[PDB]
Amino acid sequence: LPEELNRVRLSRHKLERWCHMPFFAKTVTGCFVRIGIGKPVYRVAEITGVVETAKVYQLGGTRTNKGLQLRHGNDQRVFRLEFVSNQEFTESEFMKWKEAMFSAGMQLPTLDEINKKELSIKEALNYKFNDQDIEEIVK
Amino acid sequence: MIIPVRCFTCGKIVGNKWEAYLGLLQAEYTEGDALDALGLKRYCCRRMLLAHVDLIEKLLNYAPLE
Amino acid sequence: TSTYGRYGSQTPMYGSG
Amino acid sequence: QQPMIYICGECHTENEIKSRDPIRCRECGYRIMYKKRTKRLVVFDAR
Ligand SMILES: [Zn+2]
Ligand SMILES: [Zn+2]
């Protein structure tokens, strides 16, 4: 179903609050994003990890140069956090992603996997900044 | 800190004249002539433009942001 | 205050660049 | 759901500070920050 898959969808507004928070390769790795390719067609890709691009760009108020190593079945390349869209996974794009996964052979993640992964973002959002992370964030 | 809106004693509007007074003083006029050029007959209303101190500039120097 | 999208702010594309 | 937004001292940038947290700006890092105007009905009489 698309409604259940949209739960872990990392919109463009949420990613602005973890631009420098540690454990970014742990809480982010596992969720899906609606990266815009470009005309209105979108392709869902899996978050394999985290990379850093040599180009610095401004995203509204803040500004980040980190990239995002995504992959859609087999086709993989470097992307940016600025092309991500805030729209939810439509039926057509959901079917396209399912077909791409079936063709690539990657087993679809289990519903319990998504159920236990969606809580990661929720628990990270209310995380108290009691440790020595503000120094690194400001740096 | 800022030019008042009305003369305390008389009540004539004087707030809308500070800029004109500064301009007239700048171009060539002197104070004694500029006041009556603006139209301040009573001496009570002239103290508004002679005694008034403009501290809003020093206040604005402390810009909050940028 | 999670995501005040209200759509969005014109999301750029990859091939557009 | 009010995280008690504050205003940095010199950055004049908003910050979200919750209880049991250090008082510092999200960037640079300073120790001074002021509050934002209330949302109440501040109604004066021009008297
Ligand atoms: Zn007078
Ligand atoms: Zn700070």
Classified as helix, coil or strand, A32 is strand
Please give the domain boundaries of chain D with CATH numbers for all domains.
4-47 (2.20.28.30)
End-to-end CA distance of chain D: 38
Q: What is the CATH superfamily name and number for domain B1-66?
A: Homeodomain-like (1.10.10.60)
Question: Any idea which residue has 């628990």 for tokens?
Answer: A123
**Phi, psi (5° rounding) for residue A98?**
-60, -45
Smallest Cα distance from A116 to chain C, Å = 20
Residue of A nearest to C10 (CA): A85
End-to-end CA distance of chain C: 31
Q: How many CB atoms lie within 10 A of CB A27?
A: 19
| Cross-chain CB nearest to C13 (options A11, A38, A87) | A38
Q: How many CB atoms lie within 10 A of CB A131?
A: 10
Could you tell me where the beta strands, DSSP code E, fall in A26-103? Answer: 32-33, 45-47, 51-59, 62-72, 75-80
> What whole-number distance in Å separates Cα of residue B29 and Cα of residue B27?
6
- Binding-site members of B are 7, 10, 44-45
The kind and range of the H/E element at A114 are helix A111-125
Smallest Cα distance from A56 to chain C, Å = 15
What are the residue boundaries of the structural domains of chain B, listed by start?
1-66
Interruption sites in chain D after residues (C→N beyond 2.5 Å): none
| Cross-chain CB nearest to A13 (options C4, C12, C13) | C4
Q: Which residues of A touch C15 (CB under 8 A)?
A: 37-38
DSSP output for D4-34: -EEEESSS--EEE--SS-----SSS--S-EE
Identity of residue D6: Y
> What whole-number distance in Å separates Cα of residue B37 and Cα of residue A125?
67
Measured in Å, residue A49 CA sits from the centre of ligand 1 at 76
* Experimental technique: cryo-EM
Using a CB cutoff of 5 Å, list residues around ligand 1, an ion.
B 7, 9-10, 44-45
Nearest partner of A136 among A22, A41, A7, judged by Cα:
A22
Residue of A nearest to D25 (CA): A138
> What whole-number distance in Å separates Cα of residue B56 and Cα of residue B1?
5
> What whole-number distance in Å separates Cα of residue A82 and Cα of residue A46?
17
Q: How many CB atoms lie within 10 A of CB B43?
A: 11
> What whole-number distance in Å separates Cα of residue A92 and Cα of residue D18?
42
C 1-17: CB under 8 A from A:
2-5, 7-9, 11-16
Cross-chain residue pair A83–C15, CB shorter than 8 Å? no
Q: Say whether residue D31 is in contact with chain A using an 8 A CB cutoff.
A: no
Question: Any idea which residue has 């503000």 for tokens?
Answer: A134
Q: How many CB atoms lie within 10 A of CB A88?
A: 14
| Cross-chain CB nearest to A134 (options D18, D20, D24) | D24
Cβ contact A65:A78 at 8 Å: no
Ramachandran region, residue D12 (left: φ > 0; alpha: ψ -120 to 50; beta: rest): left
